[model samples]
Target: IGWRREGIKYRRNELFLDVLESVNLLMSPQGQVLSAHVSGRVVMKSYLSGMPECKFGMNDKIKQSIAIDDCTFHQCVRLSERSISFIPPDGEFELMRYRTTKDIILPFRVIPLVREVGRTKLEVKVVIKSNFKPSLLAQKIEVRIPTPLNTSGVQVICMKGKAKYKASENAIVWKIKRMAGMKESQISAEIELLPTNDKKKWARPPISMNFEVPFAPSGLKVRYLKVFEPKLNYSDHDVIKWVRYIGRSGIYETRC
Candidate 1:
């Protein structure tokens, strides 16, 4: 519509599509998975003139085998021929959202072992194993291991990363710049607690994690993205298109 008024002097037909997925999991102390799921979204940024029709489809493996529990799409998008069709607006917008619980591939497996050495001493050991492809690397990995309320000091020891105790949060923050896939990193610590006069036992909280990966753990990928514009003849004009995938941890925890 704006092509008539805003002359196409600098408008280069370009589109960017991002496939983002957040993985959520809850695992038991004994290395048993309680619940795991992935929430994914498809977002698009379009800078094109006139009404351009766009078509999107997932990979055959994902379209056929992946079990999506629910999905919601933008008002401009519709279903056709097992693909998503839309006439995107001029700016950035979220195209669709989906949730999947079946066939979820967890990125990491967390194992936590805790022991009460005595009334004032505690032992904590945690092991995290990456379950993704060996060629991939997880960036900015952080593991937050909670400590007792009356914890006074902690002697943290880790072989692969840096660990420091945070009194304000009552946890040990372990940071790894980059974690290799298909490998295990561990941290062990000795916690000293103040002698409390109360009789109630200390309630151990769950361990939480944060990470960013270049690839989606849900195995969802865009098979094809096609664009069409009548007046400008986008196919001959060489429209630029980009596709990116990112995976993050959302509420990933393990009870200890």
Candidate 2:
């Protein structure tokens, strides 16, 4: 809920809360999730004078429903499920960290099919489907498909987004600016390899993905985040609070 922005006036009581989560997934080329996990953290940036106490609340039912394997808090806060009470320091700092492996909802399902056409050519096709609600949009999507070291030229075709072969990285980088939830996109490419007498085969590297979604996969929600100062007289209008959620990819690799 971040909207208003004050002009050059002296910034008063303002608090920002960010719920950042990363999805870790390992999948086989056959389109199956072998391992999955979600790790998240609460980061707070405060701009308030005097020592103000901050109270943070999480969705108790959602917290109870998702059995988090473990959680660790910063020195500022102790624990949670109950209201988190702490005195936030100036600027930005991490509040808490949590890890959960149960009921992990992956945002994207990626299927990669690679075939060798001949001694000097290879065929590759990759399909990615979003698995979230249609209302949400994922931005800055990037899928890196590794290519052989001897690749000389590539013919790329994509349904949506842009694909380019990076010779330095030795991979085809596919980038999608915006993707609506439940949408499907794919990329197909034909790779030409240089003639070589070496009999060694290229060790295929896993295809990695990167994206940013506005929601967490663990369904973690911030019920409320309130700031209060005992000595100073304050009203609800005096303090502005903003909360943001961003889900990203961490080691989201698929073996082919």
Candidate 3:
């Protein structure tokens, strides 16, 4: 009925719980979907006085198997069926890696409308659609559009967010906050081009989207993490656990 010990060295021990989920998007110039998926990995890092026997696993009721389509363990990990019982060594590593393709919620979608005007200017319009549940609002939404070289200036207009041209990066950077799901936001800009000494065909770069989402595309969740004695020694302090989930880019680019 107690979670403490005298002069316990759990104080010297620290646990790092990390949930890293990534998404990759690629599309044809005609807006055809090339490839898309949101991948996820549950990772942990341990810094402790010695080894610890940790009972670690994700949430799977009726007891497990077919739990992870594919999951790998570190060199020190010991596995029996679906059970992950091991004395983890130090440093950072991925405990389990899996694909989240089943029943994934609506991720954000981007549509770019680009047109060349009279060989002297390029017109760019971008629409970002939030396809998640309407109750949720995605944050840290940013979009990058590659601008043409030999560019003189840009006229930008954004109905919902901020749009600006960065000459040094040769790109248009747009940022938005609180993108509501089931809704769409847009940005439009006209870039004035400077005359070039040599006339040559230019290459149009792809657009990249970035954002943070609170979602588990793979229905993955931490069920329990019970940490106890390793080195078979009694410690004095209670163990502290920290867990987090983050969404970031995974080769997220679209040819628009």
Question: Largest TM-score belongs to which candidate?
Answer: 1
Taken over the whole model, the C-alpha lDDT of each candidate is 0.83, 0.84, 0.71
Cα lDDT of model 3 by residue, 54-95, tens digit: 778776532322234455666556668266776665556677
Which residue runs of candidate 2 sit more than 4 Å off their true CA positions?
A: 1-12, 60-64, 78-81, 196-199, 235-238
Candidate 2 lDDT by residue in tens digits, 33-138? 8899999998998777566667888764432356668788877774544667877667788998999888887999888889997778999998999999999999
Q: What are the clashing pairs of model 2?
A: none
What ranking emerges by lDDT with the best candidate at the front?
2, 1, 3
Better of 2 and 3 by lDDT: 2
lDDT score, candidate 3, position 14: 72
For model 2, give the 10-residue run with minimal summed lDDT: 1-10
Clashes per candidate (backbone, < 3 Å): 0, 0, 5
